[PDB]
Amino acid sequence: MKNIAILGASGSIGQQAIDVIARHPESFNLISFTVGKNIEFAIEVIEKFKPEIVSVQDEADVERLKPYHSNIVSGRQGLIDVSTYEKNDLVLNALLGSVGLEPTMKAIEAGKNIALANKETLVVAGKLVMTHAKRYGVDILPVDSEHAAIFQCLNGEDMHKIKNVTITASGGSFRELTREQLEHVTVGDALNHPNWSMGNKITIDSATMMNKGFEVIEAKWLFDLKIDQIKTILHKESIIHSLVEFVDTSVMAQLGTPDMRMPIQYAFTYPERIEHRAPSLDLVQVAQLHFQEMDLDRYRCLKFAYDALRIGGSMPVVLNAVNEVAVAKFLNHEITFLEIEHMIEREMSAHEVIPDPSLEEILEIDHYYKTKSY
Amino acid sequence: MKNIAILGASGSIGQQAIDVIARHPESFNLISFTVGKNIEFAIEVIEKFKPEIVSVQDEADVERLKPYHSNIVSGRQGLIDVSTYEKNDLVLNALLGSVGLEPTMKAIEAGKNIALANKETLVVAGKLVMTHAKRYGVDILPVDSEHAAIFQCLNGEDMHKIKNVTITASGGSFRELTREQLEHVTVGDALNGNKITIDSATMMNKGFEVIEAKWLFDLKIDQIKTILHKESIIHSLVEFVDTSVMAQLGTPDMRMPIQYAFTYPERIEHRAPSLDLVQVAQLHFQEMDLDRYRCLKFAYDALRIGGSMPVVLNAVNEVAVAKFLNHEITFLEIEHMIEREMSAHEVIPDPSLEEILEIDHYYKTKSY
């Protein structure tokens, strides 16, 4: 019976993680969690799971929870109180943005294994986080589909025997379009009404392939890979999630339909597996699987993520921050779709690279590109 | 540094294993081996490799070898002395037929890991072999693409968390032929040693592999599945109880499994062209058609029934393939001969090793 902490429990992944806990009261206990401003959700979680400590973003909201619980904290410190809570066995960091960076580091220092649902953490601070995890002897477990897949291919294997790792990609919303059709695509072409659904930024990143770019960067640090060991391939059906070729030329692959709960539960159970009630993949129904060569002239954003790996240092911090700014301009109809990549490329070209930047320089650089004039 | 024993070193498989050893002198050591009448080859191997003990089939060829002497034994007992040699680390059973059955059981009782280069051992006697190996904490690796795939999917995993295991199959040389077209198949058509070739066209080979997997991974019959996969790139899949699916992929190949068996559970470098999924472009999957591939269905019947039934399956298939090769019966008569002998068999529930040998000898030697 292991104690789970959830940072950012009211977001989409946090809620799926709570469902996993609810579906296995025999194996998991929610010992601690945080929310931003969704106090009603914190209330329902407290009554159902009786965590031992809970954090909110605003000091002002602590009084709302006092009638329900004896130990409420708030603010930037409250994330640390929760992430370093001494009864935690595993800390799921499903915070979005740079905010989850500090709490992860302090959790590692306290000796807690981390489940990362936060893509920024290893994109902007991959070296920093992984060296810290190795020094303190904790595991960084992915709860993302491609990294979960790679993680399962390497279970029981010696990392030194890896020849290379291939991440699959759908091709995104616009995969069917000609490169010239891409000169005329509108945000409407990617999203019918932005306010209907969640995941708008993520849809854009998948259409530009920045999403796969970020996953290449994370994989490089998560599994301590050389840059020329990390490959991609276009895979229309997204049934095969990743492949690993070993030095004997044997290739392991992880396959599945897209249930986002499976990697969450795997992170909670690793190295065990427990039952998950869900339909099984049926390859006879799938019938065919397609593969074709990644085209980096078309998906230039993925090319930029490899550039940020080659250059290293603070360059992936710039890539992530400017991508966030550019996708938001795109969503609010200020720039064309192809202007996303020119904006990123222009900012990358002018950036003066910093070392090996520290945690506070990473935050500085992140804030600068988010808030500068364009 | 691993001490390798080879039973049946004279055949192609034996020769392949010796190549593996010769190419990795830092990894392996040919410590003991077995030959059955090719004394010439056995001298060469003694010349090159420093074997400590050798067995020959005839008590009569023992003299020709003691000038070249390593310690030499012979006959049925010789196999057991090689198989259970104390310095053995892992024994490659490449004996063709029933003669490999008792040497492996006593190797298991001596605490030795087994590589099986023939499907007979676990088809006729999977129950017995696995029970022993379980009691003695011993690895059992069939030198086979599909089983090497499954073993790799299980790296770092719990066999108890298996939901399903799926074996893939191309469909064989006649996959694009209709059951009506099979009426006019010929030996020449089908040859494109020789018995193993027919078993692939007929799908008996995947049938045998289904039977081995059941016992190897201690699976219930509904947990062992097959699919038709034309490109033979995915070699097997394992679904776990969380519904995650692991698969092993590659170009179809045979140099890799012996080497895999020798290094298991380690991997070492192998120089061959890498799988290129961009060039393959497409992977196809279809439901397995048991009315087209009746030999596969017979394998499953033998599992459901259990006991001596798989012994009969294997024996009659060998007789039938050989009579097809000698042009006494049609390609389709293979499946009919198997069916009838199966339908008439009176099954023995938990046969001893001795009863397995009698049943196999009976169906091999009776007239039809």
Author numbering:
A (entry chain A): 1 to 374
B (entry chain B): 1 to 192, 199 to 374
Wording from the paper:
The first dedicated enzyme of the MEP pathway, deoxyxylulose phosphate reductoisomerase (DXR; E.C. 1.1.1.267), is rate-limiting for MEP pathway activity. In contrast, nonprimate-associated staphylococcal species, including S. pseudintermedius and S. schleiferi, utilize the MEP pathway for isoprenoid biosynthesis. S. schleiferi DXR is a physiologic dimer with each monomer related by crystallographic symmetry. The monomer consists of three regions: an N-terminal α/β-domain with a central 7-stranded β-sheet (β1-β7) and 7 α-helices that serves as the nucleotide binding site; a middle region of the protein that includes a second β-sheet (β8-β11) and 4 α-helices (α8 and α12-α14); and a C-terminal α-helical domain (α9-α11 and α15-α18) that locks FSM into the active site.
To establish the structural basis of FSM action, we solved the three-dimensional structures of S. schleiferi DXR as an apoenzyme and a FSM complex to 2.15 Å and 2.89 Å resolution, respectively. Comparison of the S. schleiferi DXR apoenzyme and FSM complex structures reveals how the C-terminal capping region (α9-α11 and α16–18) shifts position to allow for the α10-α11 loop to position Trp196 adjacent to the inhibitor. A DALI search identified multiple DXR from Escherichia coli, Plasmodium falciparum, M. tuberculosis, and other microbes (Z-scores: 49–51; r.m.s.d. ~1.6 Å2 for 370–400 Cα-atoms; 39–40% amino acid sequence identity). Of note, the staphylococcal DXR enzyme appears somewhat distinct from previously characterized orthologs, particularly in the α10-α11 loop sequence, which could be explored with additional SAR studies.
